[PDB]
């Protein structure tokens, strides 16, 4: 699945750079120019989500009490609550990925850095597996860039 691959690449890249605190310059080897644009939009939108819901994100992180691999494995049951109500839109998808970045940031500080990759594939799992048809209909990562374009 090229979409699973491309989404995993973008998401894993965004979560890894968020835990690090500094943005990379090296190229994306699968995603392409679509992935470059997708990651750039995700950086602008995702950071504007993380700031606008900073208190709510801090509270959710505290309440979740993530400290080990079992907690990271169970986080998939929390991820589905973003789609639980039958609502699917780019606004929900960005929030799902922005919080993923917040968790990844927490996992790095609490020295559980090896659990970031498992989390990134879990976000991609819930996205690409439960919402494939909608993503493809919405023109995947191109539609994502087109939807959030402001001008």
């Amino acid at each position: 699945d090229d979409l699973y691959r491309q989404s995993l690449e973008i998401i894993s890249r965004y979560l890894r750079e968020q835990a690090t605190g500094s943005k990379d310059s090296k190229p994306l080897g699968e995603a392409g120019a679509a992935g470059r644009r997708a990651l750039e939009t995700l950086r602008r939108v995702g950071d504007g989500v993380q700031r606008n819901h900073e208190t709510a994100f801090q509270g959710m992180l505290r309440k979740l009490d993530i400290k080990n691999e079992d907690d990271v494995k169970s986080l998939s049951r929390v991820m589905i609550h973003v789609f639980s109500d039958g609502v699917t839109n780019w606004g929900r998808i960005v929030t799902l990925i922005s919080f993923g970045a917040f968790v990844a940031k927490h996992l790095k500080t609490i020295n559980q850095e090896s659990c970031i990759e498992p989390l990134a594939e879990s976000i991609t799992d819930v996205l690409v597996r439960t919402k494939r048809d909608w993503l493809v209909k919405q023109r995947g990562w191109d539609g994502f860039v087109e939807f959030f374009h402001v001008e």
Epitope: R37, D142, G143, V145, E146, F147, F148, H149, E151
Partner: antibody, heavy 119, light 110 residues
């Protein structure tokens, strides 16, 4: 001034090929899905083809599948339509239309370019 | 065409005219409907987007609605300047294509 201007339309023989071009101005072209819509004189609008911002998602009407090829050059703010194996029924004014990211409405249209398929 | 519209519509000045657009579950039933106005000898222009939203410049007289697999365009206060071809359009999920209605030619009589 946000504009779209089609070019390349003209007389072509049945079985022939023609390339239409559409120049975008005043906006960030690489952040929009684009469309071709045609209209036979005195007849209705018929959507032809669509291409996403990074060319990852391409669509065609059944009436044009295997004969028309849509593509775009984001560096040249250009949309193209390579039409091959042209028949009388392809005679129409071809429009270029920008698609809104959030609603999918075709907010900007070009003035159109006439293609006449005749011997 | 996949979306059907009455070929023609008519009314007198000031009357309220209605133009229907009939589709299926995979087009109007799954997606928003847009309307285009094509004045004689002009390129089409966006009239209505998201079923009932008006772009800047479209007067209050135009309104749209959607229910089930059908959509409707309502022109209150018919004027001679409303004489045009009206088209509805919706994305179709089962075809992976945009479907335009056949078009409605509006004549303002009387």
């Amino acid at each position: 001034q946000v504009t779209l201007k089609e070019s390349g339309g003209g007389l072509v023989k049945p079985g022939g090929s023609l390339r239409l071009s559409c120049a975008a101005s005043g906006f960030t072209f690489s952040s929009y899905s684009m469309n071709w819509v045609r209209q036979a004189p005195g007849k209705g609008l018929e959507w032809v083809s669509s291409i996403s911002s990074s060319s990852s998602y391409i669509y065609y009407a059944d009436s044009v599948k295997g004969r028309f090829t849509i593509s775009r050059d984001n560096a040249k703010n250009s949309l193209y339509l390579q039409m091959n194996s042209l028949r009388a029924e392809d005679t129409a004014v071809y429009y270029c239309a920008r698609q809104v990211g959030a609603t999918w409405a075709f907010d900007i249209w070009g003035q159109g370019t006439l293609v006449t398929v005749s011997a | 065409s996949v979306l059907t519209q009455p070929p023609s519509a008519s009314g007198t000045p000031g009357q309220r005219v209605t133009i229907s657009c009939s589709g299926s579950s995979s087009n109007i039933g799954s997606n928003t409907v847009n309307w285009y106005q094509q004045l004689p000898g002009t390129a089409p222009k966006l009239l209505i987007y998201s079923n009932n939203q008006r772009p800047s410049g479209v007067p209050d007289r135009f309104s749209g609605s959607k229910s089930g697999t059908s959509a409707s365009l309502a022109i209150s206060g018919l004027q001679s300047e409303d004489e045009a071809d009206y088209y509805c359009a919706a994305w179709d999920d089962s075809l992976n294509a945009w479907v335009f209605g056949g078009g409605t030619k509006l004549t303002v009589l009387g």
